């Protein structure tokens, strides 16, 4: 059974090949205590990783090891992988090959560092590394299409063809879940709620996942929200306080389609998807339009499928047909696609064996698995 | 002439447009006698507002109507404004327009009640609300730079590239002069001095204003103070006792650059300036670096400009040059900038007329003012 570990900026999913759901899904944070300890004999640890950090997040400084898709701290990344195998999964990687997932347009330094870290610290027998966006379409069951990969890192639009990522057609986008979370607390201060610390950032993320939604029409919804109190909903903080949000429900997710709210010159995810398609060839343009698949936790807002379809329809020519595919399992689309690829019989051919790694060195990752 | 009232968390300044200095500067405190009146010869008013309460602060419970730039008690705020117009400025508000100041990233209800009070209690012909940090740049004769304002409640960094401030790059911290005063009396107990009541709080503020200074090198200065003498200063209390403070002279201002002493996860006043600049465009970063402006009473410590320059230089790339501008009259920079704006002929069309407020109610303050 080959492990399928999908590291991510927000959450990392781990499990086994052939399963339909990840075994362990915990936040990818590494918190350290900022206060000195007074009670002796408790055996308190120095660093808390995963669910332990979230439970005790009040007295910790939560730092995300991965920011904007690049690992800014390679010492904390080893801590999370160590916690994934021994603690959450309780399986020694000595007898199980490990599958890792990259990000589109990843620097070559990260590619070799991931191979070097695991082949020595964990010494797994075999490895294969694949693109997260590529695996997103594999879970949906189609090999050709354009993936609107979004998450807590950076939004990527990768129009893969025949299971291969087009390198020139990939368009980056920094609009992600973290930006909306930071933007939500900036506009929540207008009602008198002040969330500033990193511990309270997790609280805002819970609000975004439960109450926020995408409105079909922004101008129509704005007038309705001001006139009537129907749109207001109540949320309860961990301390017992009750808060009310009236029109922030459809104003924070709207920043995806209108980045000018955050002050970014780049266009929204509706126009980036259209721009990426235009970069591809004319003949294969027909197939990509009808096989667009959303992925990641950012695209889980209610009504985002309808808003995206309507707005991309106007930009696209009237001859083109739009079919936004939004599977309900799109949160774990990256992991599920990885499990499908690992379980394949022909997948044994492109393993990176431990014996082959020593003779070739860390540079084998560039040419073997691409 | 147009009255320019700059209500502040600690002190409020009121005057006339075109003047070079505020006419009246008194503390923004409202006190009520906790003890029972025993004599009948004198008036023995219910409450005292301004410097009247400061003189009799022994027998009163001083309460600040403004906390962190938000008016917590609107009953006491009406007392202060009634005292400003009728006792200090001794003018009728019914004939002169009034210009007010509000901190950025404030609750919408804070400036909505300000419009309602002005147009219903004092019947001012016109009104306007302006950002405190924006006016601080006008007093220095600049229209392109970053303003580091710091008072009693708010310490906000507002990068202003043009006549209008950049909204997406505004950073606000709830660490200011009042927070340092509470920290100064906490570490003063280490030497055996106990200041608890609000009347004793005003004594600590005098000590902070006269003896505290920012050390260029905190680690080196702590070792120097460990050798005793050459750094202890003597202060005389209103009772008559003489107190000596050693390393507390620079420890209290050091909480600005190291907020971890107060248990706040927020970054220091030096990092929050660099972070604010990083949110702007690449082309504009060159101008903002060389046009940094300090303002407010908190930044009046001896040597804060020198210390701030060193900290920013290490964080900023060595190619860029850092020039911190510290005008001699930066205490009244907020009011002086407002005087220039009010006296401008173009500003006559930006006033909110009485008829305009009636047709739209208090909500017009959000759409017109900024």
């Amino acid at each position: 059974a080959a492990l399928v570990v999908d590291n991510g900026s927000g959450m990392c999913k781990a499990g086994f090949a052939g399963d339909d759901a990840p075994r362990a899904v915990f936040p990818s944070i590494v918190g350290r205590p900022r206060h000195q300890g007074v009670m002796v004999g408790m055996g308190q640890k120095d660093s808390y990783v995963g669910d332990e950090a979230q439970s005790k997040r009040g007295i910790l400084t939560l730092k995300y090891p991965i920011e904007h898709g690049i690992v800014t701290n390679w010492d904390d990344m080893e801590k999370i992988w160590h916690h994934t195998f021994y603690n959450e999964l309780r399986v020694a990687p000595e007898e199980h090959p490990v599958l890792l997932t990259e990000a589109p347009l990843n620097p070559k330094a990260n590619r070799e560092k991931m191979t070097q870290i695991m082949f020595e610290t964990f010494n797994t027998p075999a490895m294969y590394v694949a693109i997260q966006a590529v695996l997103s379409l594999y879970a949906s069951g189609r090999t050709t299409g354009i993936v609107m990969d979004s998450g807590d890192g950076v939004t990527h639009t990768v129009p893969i063809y025949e299971g291969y990522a087009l390198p020139h057609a990939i368009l980056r986008l920094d609009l992600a879940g973290r930006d909306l979370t930071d933007y939500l607390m900036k506009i929540l201060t207008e009602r008198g709620y002040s969330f500033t610390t990193t511990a309270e950032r997790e609280i805002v993320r819970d609000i975004k996942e439960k109450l926020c939604y995408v409105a079909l029409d922004f101008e129509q919804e704005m007038a309705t929200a001001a006139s009537s109190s129907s749109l207001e909903k109540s949320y309860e903080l961990p301390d017992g306080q009750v808060i009310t949000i009236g029109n922030e429900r459809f104003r924070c997710p709207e920043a995806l389609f209108q980045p000018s709210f955050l002050g970014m010159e780049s266009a929204g995810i509706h126009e980036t998807t259209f721009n990426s398609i235009m970069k591809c060839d004319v003949d294969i343009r027909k197939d990509l339009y009808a096989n667009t698949v959303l992925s990641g936790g950012t695209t889980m807002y209610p009504g985002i499928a309808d808003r995206m379809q309507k707005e991309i329809t106007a930009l696209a020519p009237s001859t083109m047909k739009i079919k936004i595919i939004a599977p309900p399992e799109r949160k774990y689309s990256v992991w599920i696609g990885g499990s499908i690829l690992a379980s394949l019989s022909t997948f044994q051919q492109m393993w990176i064996s431990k014996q082959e790694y020593d003779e070739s060195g860390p540079s084998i990752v560039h040419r073997k698995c691409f | 002439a147009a009255l320019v009232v700059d209500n502040g968390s600690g002190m409020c300044k009121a005057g006339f447009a075109g003047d070079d200095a505020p006419r009246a500067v008194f503390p923004s405190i409202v006190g009520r006698p906790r003890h029972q009146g025993v004599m009948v010869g004198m008036g023995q008013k219910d409450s005292y507002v301004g410097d009247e309460a400061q003189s009799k602060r022994g027998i009163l419970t001083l309460k600040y109507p403004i906390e962190h730039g938000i008016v917590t008690n609107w009953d006491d705020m009406e007392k202060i404004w009634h005292h400003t117009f009728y006792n200090e400025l001794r003018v009728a508000p019914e004939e002169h327009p009034v210009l007010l100041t509000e901190a950025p990233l404030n609750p919408k209800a804070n400036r909505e009640k300000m419009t309602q009070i002005m147009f219903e209690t004092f019947n001012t012909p016109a009104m306007y609300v302006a950002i405190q940090a924006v006016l601080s740049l006008y007093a220095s004769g600049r229209t392109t730079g970053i303003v580091m304002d710091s008072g009693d409640g708010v310490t906000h960094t507002v990068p202003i590239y043009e006549g209008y401030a950049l909204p997406h790059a505004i950073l606000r911290l709830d660490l200011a002069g009042r927070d340092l005063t509470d920290y100064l009396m906490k570490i003063l107990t280490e030497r055996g001095y106990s200041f608890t009541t609000t009347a004793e709080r005003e004594i600590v503020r005098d000590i902070k204003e006269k003896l505290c200074y920012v050390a260029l090198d905190f680690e080196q200065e702590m070792a120097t103070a460990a050798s005793s003498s050459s750094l202890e200063k003597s202060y005389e209390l209103p009772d008559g006792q003489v107190i000596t403070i050693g390393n507390e002279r620079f420890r209290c201002p050091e909480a600005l650059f190291q907020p971890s002493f107060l248990g706040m996860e927020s970054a220091g006043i030096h990092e929050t300036t660099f972070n604010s600049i990083m949110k702007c465009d690449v082309d504009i970063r060159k101008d903002l670096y060389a046009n940094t402006v300090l303002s407010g009473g908190t930044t009046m410590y001896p040597g804060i400009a020198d210390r701030m320059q060193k900290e920013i230089t290490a964080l900023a790339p060595s190619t860029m040059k850092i020039k911190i501008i510290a005008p001699p009259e930066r205490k009244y920079s907020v009011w002086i900038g407002g005087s220039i704006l009010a006296s401008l002929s173009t500003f006559q069309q930006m006033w909110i007329s009485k008829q305009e407020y009636d047709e739209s109610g208090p909500s017009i303050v959000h759409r017109k003012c900024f």
Binding site: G192, Y193, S194, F195, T196, I243 | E67, H68
Partner: peptide
């Protein structure tokens, strides 16, 4: 404030 701080 309402939720957070004291103001």
């Amino acid at each position: 404030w309402x939720a957070x701080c004291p103001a």
